[PDB]
């Protein structure tokens, strides 16, 4: 289907990606809503969702 992704605002503002692996990677994050860059190194984060103090 020749799917592309363009970003508006944020870090990636003004950029467009067309290679299927990259476009697919952003589509996978879009099921979570808005897309963010995370530091996963400082805490050795494992990539699995946890609840907030509201939940606990």
């Amino acid at each position: 289907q020749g799917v592309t992704v363009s970003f508006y605002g944020g870090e990636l503002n003004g950029q467009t990606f067309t290679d299927p692996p990259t476009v697919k990677s952003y589509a996978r994050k879009a099921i979570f809503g808005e897309i963010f860059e995370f530091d996963t190194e400082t805490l050795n984060s494992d990539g699995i969702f946890r609840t907030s103090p509201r939940g606990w």
Binding site: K24, S25, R28, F32, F38, T40, S45, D46, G47, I48, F49
Partner: protein, 244 residues
């Protein structure tokens, strides 16, 4: 004196190639004007050797013995193909079809299991020139194809595959992908193997030959997830040669 399925079933003989008597030391004449085929090629492995992976490059690694754990399911059989007479008098066997692969798992000292696709798929094997008769001095040497041990639909335990399956580690929804690329992106191996067939017995009247073989090929690479091992397979073979 001819055995039935009920004579054979459960004995292990079904995984064994036919043998020839010690009196079978004859010669099978080749008519350069006649066309020939191998009506049945059988390869019965007796030893699987795996080359160790040494830490020292100055050290020459050796092939070490292994324990077969997948039982009497290892032989290649009912293989057929053209036996060409070349202009220089050499013969070339061109494999056409048959039960020409077996998945095999052998186990190294310490427990490491080595799966491989023991095979002669697409074998092309040739003798020396000027083979006017097949004798106990005739040898066949050739190459074959070794496709991926798993084919393209195979799904790993987290549901990932090449022609099917997930393309990511779905249990880690927000992990960084780069470190998982080798496990996430399945790749299909296709390499070459080499084999030698040493004729040891010939029944000139029936066109049957038997002997020993040695073949070398790579083991399973788990669809690109890790490096394969080098394997050397030794065993006995049988072939029936017919005018075609």
């Amino acid at each position: 004196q001819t055995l039935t399925y009920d004579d054979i079933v459960g004995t292990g003989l079904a995984n064994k190639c036919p043998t020839l008597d010690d009196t079978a030391r004859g010669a099978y004449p080749i008519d350069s004007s006649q066309t020939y085929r191998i009506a049945r090629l059988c390869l019965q492995p007796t030893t699987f050797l795996v080359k160790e992976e040494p830490k020292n490059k100055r050290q020459e690694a050796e092939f070490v013995p292994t324990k077969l754990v997948t039982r009497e399911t290892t032989s290649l059989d009912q293989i057929q193909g053209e036996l060409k007479v070349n202009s220089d008098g050499s013969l070339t066997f061109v494999e056409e079809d048959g039960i020409d692969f077996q998945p095999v798992t052998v186990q190294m000292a310490g427990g490491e299991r080595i799966p491989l696709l023991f095979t002669v798929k697409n074998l092309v094997a040739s003798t020396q020139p000027n083979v006017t008769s097949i004798t106990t001095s005739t040898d066949f040497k050739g190459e074959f194809n070794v496709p991926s041990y798993r084919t393209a639909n195979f799904l790993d335990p987290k549901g990932r595959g090449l022609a099917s399956g997930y393309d990511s580690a779905i249990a880690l929804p927000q992990a960084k992908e780069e470190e998982l690329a080798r496990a996430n992106v399945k790749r299909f191996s296709l390499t070459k193997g080499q084999i030698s067939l040493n004729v040891a017995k010939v029944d000139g009247r029936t066109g049957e030959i038997a002997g020993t073989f040695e073949s070398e090929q790579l083991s399973d690479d788990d669809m690109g997830a890790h490096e394969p091992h080098e394997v050397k397979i030794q065993g006995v073979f049988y072939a029936s040669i017919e005018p075609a």
